[PDB]
Design a protein around this nucleic acid. Structure first.
Lengths: 117, 103, 56, 110, 150, 48, 142
RNA sequence: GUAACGGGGCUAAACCAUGCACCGAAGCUGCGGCAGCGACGCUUAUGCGUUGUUGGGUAGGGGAGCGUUCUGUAAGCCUGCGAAGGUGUGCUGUGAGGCAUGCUGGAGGUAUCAGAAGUGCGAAUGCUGACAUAAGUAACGAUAAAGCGGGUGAAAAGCCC
RNA sequence: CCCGGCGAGGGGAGUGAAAAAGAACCUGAAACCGUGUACGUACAAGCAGUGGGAGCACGCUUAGGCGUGUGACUGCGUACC
């Protein structure tokens, strides 16, 4: 039998080009450039699932760091004070109240300063 | 009053009034969830912590939905070496609604 | 000397922002002519400041 | 009452017409038709008969006046083409393409 | 296709493309590139397997309770109205008819259906035998189906 | 009643592998069988 | 997993005038940059920096330490003419006194885009051509 | 063109000696979801339980599946009481795919499963078609040039008189 | 019935089940040029995508970082065969 290439490329087009909406230029309308665009994306999307966590952690440490430096000793001595008093899983994402009012964990920081130089 | 708690290896920030997302419970809607694994209660001012996940005070909640997530796609690919593969995943969850935090 | 890739439609429209086509940029309302007054120019019946001066 | 005038298979390309067309775009019919009468350009004469034609059937037939109309839409798209032989060096017989454009005026009430 | 004599090469390496004969199958009408074949496929099957399949299918019609003996599965005339009113009354339409005798008085009758088929019992083939709703036969055809199977 | 509507043993419905079409392949692309050789391109046998 | 998330709303600046008091060129410098990010304080923003609005006004309250009176990097040049041209640590104070402090904070600026996003929050407005006393900001000594 | 500490900056914010901390990868690990397969438990036509190293992968090996044109059951059955096709979104599955549904549409369609194939294009300096491009860029055909008045004509910067 | 040459081309009116069947008429994509609306662009810039995302229209914001579409700004980052 002859096969006129069917309604299968029609279904595959509608899948790819739908994922390829909000893309600039030829990257939404030309299937070749689309296919390419879609691959670059799915690579980005899986990398930044983890990679977001690594980036946010820098900030989570840095809100703790400012608050602690005003309240006495620095951040790394404070994590080791906390390890000394209460073990903990040593939380860095420890509080949303680290962003506003730079007084927080002040009792814990004075303790930490005495416990390490 | 705001507080932080442990649900699994997922760690959870919360206020009073807040709906929050957590790891799958066997629990279904219409039940009460509570976390005594509360690490501190704070507002503008984080307390001093002697034992890990202090047993004093609670976070009360209730389940408002147990379902399963919608389908995200994960693309595995490497240029120049001709490698291309695709996977799906959904993951289950439980949503809890915080009915109050202690004082 | 040639190109490297096919132009996008954003390219074409920006390049014309300062190179498109222009005309006489309107004309005024009349007072004295048989036609409508061409701004600060004489009409073909002639009456602008006075008489049939233009006749063609 | 609302009117389309077209001129299909018209001698200009649509990139070249859009130049003149955006000068009369949204100006209202009566004002637009004056500013265009006193433009001494052949592209401007070409669109003019299609502007006048759109307006002229609206003031007639199933309606009256001109001042009640506005120019709601005005656009141009790439129609057919005629291929012509351009004289060139070493007997090169490269094609030069004569784009006819399909010209659309829409008048309506506001 | 023709192109035994002609090439769109005649020395090239400067210009465009690395293709250079006009009878190529990747042209619109130059032919087809998936290779070529006959699309009828004669196949016999070995004699104990074939006959042992027809034994499978006959057992299946019995497990499903379909085999019949009746007096007078045929009239004496080509006339469709005499047979067709006898089998309708007998509640015996839409049947695989296996004849033990074969003539025009049965074959030109009962034609008033879209579902009616005639085959001979010394040649009953496995593609007829698995299809149709019930198998009606007569006692003579049932004899001759055994003889086809042995 | 039915015909040709059998789901047979594991050998009668055999297909092996097909790799020729689709981009995602393991013998479809990258030459015929390996690279920059005879079987890796048109040819593969001349004599028995 | 789900909770409050970082935004361009959670941002604080306000207006600071940095009147230093004889602090050495780089211990002033690295603090000016630090605050121009907001790393002297909390960020919580994986995106544009929170910063502060910084006026530099002190200009001349700089001192030196070491042999960096003449050896220090400020070398620059252009494709227009060839060679190198230079400026000394003593030159940078002796004319337009602002200039030493300005190109101490300059070189700390990140990448392309973010280092510009910082820059638009800093102000000098040329050495000894000042008018920022008309605001009277939050004072700062260092 | 600063431009080997990568740079700012540092004369102690350096280098060296002793030691501690912290942070720092899909690794290490907990959590939720899952893959295939060994060992053992209930113990089966069909399953389920504890536990376990394990799951980066091309060439290449070996298996299975989808849909498309067509067929076979399709001899039946649904149909202007809205069939093929076209298309936006939502759902759903590991994925190919599948289904719900608004718009369009005015007759055809149908599994499961087995069989046939000119069977999914985006690439071969590929073949054909429509038609895009640097661009409103370049071109004004021995400068046997042209003026102005009147006119053909719906209209005259180049035409005719 | 309207514009125009006597033209090119269309509309309106009226026909028909259908003119989103109008004569190249079958339903109808994509390249192809333009319009219309929403929202974005005047301190800004790299495979143009992802991560976080002001905002604005619409959604009783699910009141619970949110949904749709878009996106200042900015972390991070090198197409496919």
């Amino acid at each position: 039998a002859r096969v006129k290439r069917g309604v299968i490329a029609r279904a595959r087009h509608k899948k790819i080009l739908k994922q390829a909406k909000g893309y600039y230029g030829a990257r939404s309308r030309v299937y070749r450039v689309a296919f390419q665009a879609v691959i670059k994306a799915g690579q980005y999307a899986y990398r930044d699932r983890r990679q977001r966590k690594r980036q946010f952690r820098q900030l989570w440490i840095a809100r703790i760091n400012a608050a602690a430096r005003q309240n006495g000793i620095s951040y790394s001595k404070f994590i080791n004070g906390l390890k000394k008093a209460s073990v903990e899983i040593d939380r860095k994402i420890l509080a949303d109240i680290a962003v506003f009012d730079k007084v927080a964990f002040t009792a814990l920081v004075e303790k930490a300063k005495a416990a390490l130089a | 009053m705001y507080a932080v708690f442990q649900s699994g290896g997922k760690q959870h920030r919360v206020s009073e009034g807040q709906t929050v997302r957590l790891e799958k419970l066997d629990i279904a809607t219409g039940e009460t969830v509570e976390f005594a694994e509360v690490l501190m209660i704070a507002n503008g001012e984080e307390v001093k912590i002697g034992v890990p996940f202090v047993d004093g005070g609670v976070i009360k909640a209730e389940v408002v939905a147990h379902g399963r997530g919608e389908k995200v796609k994960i693309v595995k690919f490497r240029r120049r070496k001709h490698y291309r593969k695709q996977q799906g995943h959904r993951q289950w969850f439980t949503d809890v609604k915080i009915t109050g935090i202690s004082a | 000397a040639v190109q490297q890739n096919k132009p996008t439609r954003s390219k074409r429209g920006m390049r014309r922002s300062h190179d498109a086509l222009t005309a006489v940029t309107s004309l005024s309302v009349d007072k004295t002519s048989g036609e409508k007054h061409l701004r600060h120019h004489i009409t073909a019946d002639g009456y602008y400041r006075g008489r049939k001066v233009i006749a063609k | 009452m609302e009117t389309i005038a077209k001129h299909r298979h018209a001698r200009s390309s649509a990139q070249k017409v859009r130049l003149v067309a955006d000068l009369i775009r949204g100006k209202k019919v009566s004002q637009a038709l004056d500013i265009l009468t006193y433009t001494n350009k052949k592209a401007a004469v070409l669109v003019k008969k299609v502007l006048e034609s759109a307006i002229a059937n609206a003031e007639h037939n199933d309606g009256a006046d001109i001042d009640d109309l506005k120019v709601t839409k005005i656009f141009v798209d790439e129609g057919p083409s005629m291929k012509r032989i351009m004289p060139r060096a070493k007997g090169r017989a490269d094609r030069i393409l004569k784009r006819t454009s399909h010209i659309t005026v829409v008048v309506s009430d506001r | 296709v023709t192109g035994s004599g002609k090439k769109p090469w005649r020395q090239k390496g400067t210009g465009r493309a690395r293709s250079g004969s006009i009878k190529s199958p990747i042209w619109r009408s130059g032919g087809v590139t998936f290779a070529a074949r006959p699309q009828d496929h004669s196949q016999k099957v070995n004699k104990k397997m074939y006959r042992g399949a027809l034994k499978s299918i006959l057992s299946e019609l019995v497990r499903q309770d379909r085999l019949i003996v009746v007096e007078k599965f045929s009239v004496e005339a080509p006339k469709t109205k005499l047979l067709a009113q006898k089998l309708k009354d007998m509640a015996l339409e839409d049947v695989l008819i296996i004849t033990g005798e074969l003539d025009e008085n049965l074959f030109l009758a009962a034609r008033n259906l879209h579902k009616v088929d005639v085959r001979d019992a010394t040649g009953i083939d496995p593609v007829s035998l698995i299809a149709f709703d019930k198998v009606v036969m007569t006692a003579d055809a049932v004899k001759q189906v055994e003889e086809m199977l042995a | 009643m039915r015909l040709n509507t059998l789901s047979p043993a594991e050998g009668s419905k055999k297909a092996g592998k097909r790799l020729g079409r689709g981009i995602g392949s393991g013998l479809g692309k990258t030459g015929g069988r390996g690279h920059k050789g005879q079987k890796s391109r048109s040819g593969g046998g001349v004599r028995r | 997993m789900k909770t409050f998330t970082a935004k361009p709303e959670t941002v604080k600046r306000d207006w600071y005038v940095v009147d230093a008091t004889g602090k050495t060129l780089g211990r002033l410098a690295t603090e000016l940059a630090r605050r121009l990010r907001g790393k002297h304080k909390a960020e919580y923003t994986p995106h544009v920096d929170t910063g502060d609005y910084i006026i530099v006004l002190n200009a001349d309250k700089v001192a030196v330490t070491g042999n960096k009176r003449t050896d220090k990097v400020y070398y620059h040049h252009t494709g227009h003419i060839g060679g190198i041209k230079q400026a000394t640590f003593e030159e940078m104070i002796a004319r337009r006194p602002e200039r030493v402090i300005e190109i101490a904070v300059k070189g700390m600026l990140p990448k392309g885009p973010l280092g510009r996003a910082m820059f638009r929050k800093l102000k000098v407005y040329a050495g000894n051509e000042h008018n920022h006393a008309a605001q009277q900001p939050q004072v700062l000594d260092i």
